[model samples]
Target: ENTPLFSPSLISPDVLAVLPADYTIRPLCRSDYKRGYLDVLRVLTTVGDINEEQWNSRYEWIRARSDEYYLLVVCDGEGRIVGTGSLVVERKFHSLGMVGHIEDIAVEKGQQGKKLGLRIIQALDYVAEKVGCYKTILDCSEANEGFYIKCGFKRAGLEMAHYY
Candidate 1:
């Protein structure tokens, strides 16, 4: 059984219509581990060999908190995940304030230049807005500034991190 984090209706039909017909986008399911999900994320970071058991445990943790995590995946006609992104809705104390943190956007190596990245962001951003987020924010390298600019993201601030 492939359980979804949330209902597909959370995604906007207008945004879905804009995606290329050969590709299908929807909320990530419990069975996506076999659909090359982690492989696609490797394009962004170092994901060590995560076996099915590991995936199941991690996915369950996230699924248990579906109200906060909205993870989406884009699959090609070949039934493989070529792109993926996530929108983490954070409920803040500022009186009904919700903020969407766009994270872990990755496109398979041969999948760039086809606007898959753009469409994925659009879909996630639309969900963020429809969910009542006051704003959405993301952090990317200087190299990705051009791409984010085309996606209508403004350079609002810098990212500071401390890695252990």
Candidate 2:
């Protein structure tokens, strides 16, 4: 059964502590891609479905819009990238007006199950709020909504998809 998003009655400070020490959450700067694109390389190299040129095109576009969007990265104590997410600001829409779309959030497989994903998301939400977005949106696979709910997103309802 699906239900509306609910806020947790109580959240533990421990949830915040699980993030690694020296874990910095900040808007990704252009230099960050230089330092951290290897993590992007690490993730895409393992995913068999996406082509190398697709990755290259996406990276080029992101680099081209360096000032208009906010990409975030979370690093380990040693400053190695462990996870990332991005916020794409929308200026036009028929129904929703404007929005901040979150995308490309992934954690290294070895880093799964800790609160790293949640921390990265929370940081993104903070960034969204800072940018004055009316709403923030992200789409997850059906199997993944539970984790998103735990991070404070509600079921926004049916989304359609088509591939030619």
Candidate 3:
């Protein structure tokens, strides 16, 4: 069930030729709302059903600031969104450069081990480099740290948090 509103495209020439033909990687859009939600829920349960207006409002806010934010999604040949990740680049006065943070990365349970997760991370990295980020980073559990290592990331510093 493909939607005409969102046409997938190669995110970058470096990754384009390597991706499997059955998969498409591109920037997330309004057309992907339903399937994207389904994909994300496979990893995080906090996301619940919400009205289209709320979704559209969030989309518009991100769209208006496209220069610094990106939400990338990967879909299968059947048009099912299977993975998603986000990148937010912050302009930092310290380095006189931008710092990119990748967050909310998820791949559907059945789709694990297919390297879709790596592709999404690579896409985010590509965007960050293209935008002149001095460094790109993410936070994950100890169990997931090895995965990021395989994706060319190293442990930078410990992450401490205060939950509300």
Off by over 4 Å in 2: 1-18, 30-36, 40-64, 93-97
* Clash statistics: count for each candidate: 0, 0, 0
Pairs that clash in candidate 3? none
Query: How does model 1 fare in lDDT?
Result: 0.89
Evaluate model 3: give its TM-score.
0.87
Give each model a TM-score: 0.94, 0.69, 0.87
Q: What lDDT would each prediction earn against the true structure?
A: 0.89, 0.65, 0.78
Higher-scoring candidate on TM-score, 1 or 3: 1
Identify the leading candidate in terms of lDDT. 1
Candidate 1 backbone collisions, by pair: none
TM-score-better candidate, 2 vs 3: 3
Give one digit per residue, the lDDT tens place, for model 3 in 99-146.
Answer: 899998888888889888888899889888877888898989999898
Better of 1 and 2 by lDDT: 1
By summed lDDT, which 10 consecutive residues of candidate 2 come out lowest? 1-10
Question: Stretches of candidate 3 above 4 Å error?
Answer: 1-10, 93-95
Candidate 1: tens digits of C-alpha lDDT, residues 1-164: 37677889887787678778777888999888889998998998888988888888998899888889999999896779999999999998657689999999999989899899998899989889989988899999999999999999999998999999
